[PDB]
Design a protein around this ligand. Structure first.
Ligand SMILES: [Zn+2]
Lengths: 71, 87, 119, 87, 38, 52
RNA sequence: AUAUUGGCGAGAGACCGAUAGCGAACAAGUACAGUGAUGGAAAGAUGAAAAGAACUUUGAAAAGAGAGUGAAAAAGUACGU
RNA sequence: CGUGGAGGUCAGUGACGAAGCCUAGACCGUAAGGUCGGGUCGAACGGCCUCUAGUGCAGAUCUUGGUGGUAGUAGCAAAUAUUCAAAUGAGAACUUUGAAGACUGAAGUGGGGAAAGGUUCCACGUCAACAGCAGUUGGACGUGGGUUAGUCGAUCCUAAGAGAUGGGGAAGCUCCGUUUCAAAGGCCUGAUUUUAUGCAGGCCACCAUCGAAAGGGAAUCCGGUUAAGAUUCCGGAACCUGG
RNA sequence: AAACUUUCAACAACGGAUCUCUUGGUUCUCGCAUCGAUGAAGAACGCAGCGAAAUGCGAUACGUAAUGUGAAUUGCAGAAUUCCGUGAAUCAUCGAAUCUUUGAACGCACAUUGCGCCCCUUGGUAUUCCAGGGGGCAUGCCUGUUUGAGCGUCAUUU
């Protein structure tokens, strides 16, 4: 996930099982003040939902990751 | 060829999981559960099956609501709140 | 630590909403920190504070609805008393106490008397 | 997402004809005209009238669907119904 | 001619003393409830 | 209890199989299956002339 | 006034004492078996207290031999007798 | 004569050691049995007079549990076939690499799916048990990581079939039937010229729903990328549908 | 004479009898009357700093509020009570709340985590587009309101 953050400008989140891509994009935008280009989702075998959120070029996922506080 | 050669053909399913009781007794083609009788409104039970009744009866689960009724009855189904009378 | 209900009940709705938002932000930051720090017990206190704030907010709103409906014949079912299904289906004291005019006259004229056996 | 139908969104949903509005309000035409005059509801013109009216070119009166929806809440309508009962 | 070939039912009065006590308690309770009437 | 040792689904295996003809627990997948039942000489069976 | 092998709360016994007593004294209607209806176990006891053997030595290690704790290791979690 | 439990009694025995068990030891009784010493052990137990019973075992192809001889015996002989050196390691016929020899021989011991399984996928660590020799190996154990779609499927359609409603049966659980003996619902116009604040004039006919990841059906390709992803990610280049 | 086979003691094994225990069962007696559309019993999925079970609980998730008590919890990491107190605790009590997906189970379907309709509100380049949030939409029957249908009955010239 951190390789994705550094290279592909993609933030990886664990999200609610009940949340769809619209809600994921809206929540990420509201919570982190960044523009979202696309959201890809999957359901992990452990029963949880994982989201790959690709931001637009205006924003740096590495900087936002440092601001959140995981690096 | 009723043993292993035919056992080589065991891949289909007569019963899947039942939504109501979760027992994997829902007959696919008959659309009915052989254990709880779903989707009939009543639950399937028989006086010749006393052990089965005992397996599925009240008190074998959480009793999420029914287990507080005795305390509520003992206090008389009171409403309101306890006052801070002293200490 | 944690928030105290007798201190939350003083605040207005807006103050409680703001404090709930602050608590949720704090919980998100602590969930981030837990990924690194192997033990983080402040998570539990923050979760319980969130629960207490939500409880106080709900109490205020329900009490406002109750005062809005005070004295009305029809109340919201969640504001009505629960009791038991059979207890709610039973006759009230008034209905159970209704007697006919003939029986009331007989009861007035010939009540059960208080007597004793001495003389 | 499956294929959407071709006369459900856009002009078709934005505009409502007078007869459709009268039917939706469940009132008479006289009542509808009185309510529109009381509330400032005025006829509008779609840019794509064929798209608004299923390809028809026939001269029609169009209203905003949201304006009709708002008109549905006016208490003067309840007063009209009360008058009808009184009569 | 013909025998009883089946099994009987049994009623046992273990509660004889308990029921005597209960009747005595009920009489005292009713006496208190309707005093001073017989 | 008048049900003790009696609430079992067991039948005899019949004659000619070189085993005692006592009723035995049916089914499978547990140690109980195939074990003798109902008999006053069987572990877990009824007692002789149960007390009343 | 009568009934009551279900439910809730109580008091008792010339009853059983872990192959007994309920199937279930124990994470038992569990584990497990059967497509399914259904069928359905086994299994209690260190010591007053873990004081559950620091440390040395042989061994790759499990362990052994010392040392030690304990009233007792003829009580070492393979543990009452 | 012996056993579980009950009333009485011996102000009975006992941590200075009850009960139980072991004993090449001792004594009493025709016997059922009883008593004593020694060892082991750790918390209760007996004599007598009576009461009571789930009260005495060699058998029941008895029940449950345990354990022998057989016996280190039968057996691990299909799948042509292995061998040399080095590394790792306490330990290598079996792990890894190199070198040789062979084999499946495109109706494959190759590469993919449906179904089924459910993490077996990948990495690191590890060998108590398991993989019927071994093991440093493993689909084993411990711990983590991994499955990204407007275009691929489902979702939509109907098939054989299943099946409500309206009705009618049936004591009833429910049954028959699938369009009928049903008021089964949509749409257009209006200043319908007077009755003055109550909708008028018209148009058209048909009955749910479920049932296919092999039938029907909108539309995506190439190159690259991972330990494990891929027509889904990245780059470029397209297309479909609705507005 | 050894080895081997057999017999007893001691010590050591194997095995778990016996004895002594017992937060369990069993039987008798007594008292009480309280499940559910205000969504029950049952089922599924979750929830703890370190937890797979049992116990508890439901996204407010081994719990929130309230009341009482009055200093713990404990296996480790942890709350400090300003110690003279609206105050710990896996405490008790419990009257206020929350209560995922379901289930008689209720928008329609259902082996799909599938497919709709209505209303209010909010946010996005927004009269048209999209999304989110909140609240609704089952069947039988009763009383009542309102709107109706049928030359079915009847009235209808100062
Ligand atoms: Zn079922």
């Amino acid at each position: 996930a951190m390789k994705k953050v550094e290279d592909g400008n993609i933030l990886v989140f664990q999200v609610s099982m009940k949340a769809n891509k619209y809600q994921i994009k809206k929540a990420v935008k509201e919570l982190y003040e960044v523009d979202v280009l696309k959201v890809n989702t999957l359901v992990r075998p452990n029963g949880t939902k994982k989201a790959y959120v690709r931001l637009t070029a205006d924003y740096d996922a590495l900087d936002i990751a440092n601001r959140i506080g995981y690096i | 060829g009723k043993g292993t050669p035919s056992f080589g053909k065991r891949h289909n399913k007569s019963h899947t999981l039942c939504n109501r009781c979760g027992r994997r007794s829902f007959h696919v083609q008959k659309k009915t559960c052989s254990s709880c009788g779903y989707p009939a409104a009543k639950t399937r039970s028989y006086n010749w099956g006393a052990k089965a009744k005992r397996r599925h009866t009240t008190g074998t689960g959480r009793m999420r609501y029914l287990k507080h009724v005795s305390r509520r009855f003992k206090n008389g189904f009171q409403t309101g709140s306890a006052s801070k009378a002293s200490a | 630590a944690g928030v105290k209900a007798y201190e939350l009940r003083t605040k207005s709705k807006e103050q409680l909403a703001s404090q709930l938002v602050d608590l949720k932000k704090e919980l998100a930051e602590l969930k981030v920190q837990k990924l690194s720090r192997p033990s983080l017990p402040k998570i539990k206190t923050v979760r319980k504070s969130i629960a207490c704030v939500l409880t106080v907010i709900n109490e205020q709103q329900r009490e406002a609805v109750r005062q809005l409906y005070k004295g009305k014949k029809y109340q919201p079912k969640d504001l009505r008393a629960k009791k038991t299904r059979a207890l709610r289906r039973a006759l009230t004291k008034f209905e159970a106490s209704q007697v006919t005019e003939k029986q009331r006259k007989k009861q007035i004229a010939f009540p059960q008397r208080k007597y004793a056996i001495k003389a | 997402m499956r294929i959407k139908k071709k006369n459900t969104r856009g002009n078709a949903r934005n505009f409502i004809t007078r007869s459709q509005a009268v039917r939706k309000l469940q009132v008479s035409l006289a009542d509808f005209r009185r309510l529109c005059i009381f509330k400032g509801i005025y006829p509008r013109e779609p840019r794509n009238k064929k798209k608004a009216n299923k390809g028809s070119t026939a001269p029609t009166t169009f209203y905003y669907a949201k304006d009709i929806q708002y008109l549905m809440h006016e208490p003067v309508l309840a007063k009209f119904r009360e008058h009808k009962t009184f009569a | 001619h013909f025998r009883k070939h089946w099994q009987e039912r049994v009623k046992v009065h273990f509660d004889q003393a308990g029921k005597k006590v209960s009747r005595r308690n009920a009489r005292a309770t009713r006496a208190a409830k309707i005093a001073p009437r017989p | 209890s008048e049900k003790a040792g009696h609430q079992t689904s067991a039948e005899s295996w019949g004659t000619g199989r070189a085993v005692a003809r006592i009723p035995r627990v049916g089914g499978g997948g547990t140690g109980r299956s195939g074990q003798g039942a109902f008999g006053n000489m069987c572990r877990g069976g009824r007692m002789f002339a149960p007390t009343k």
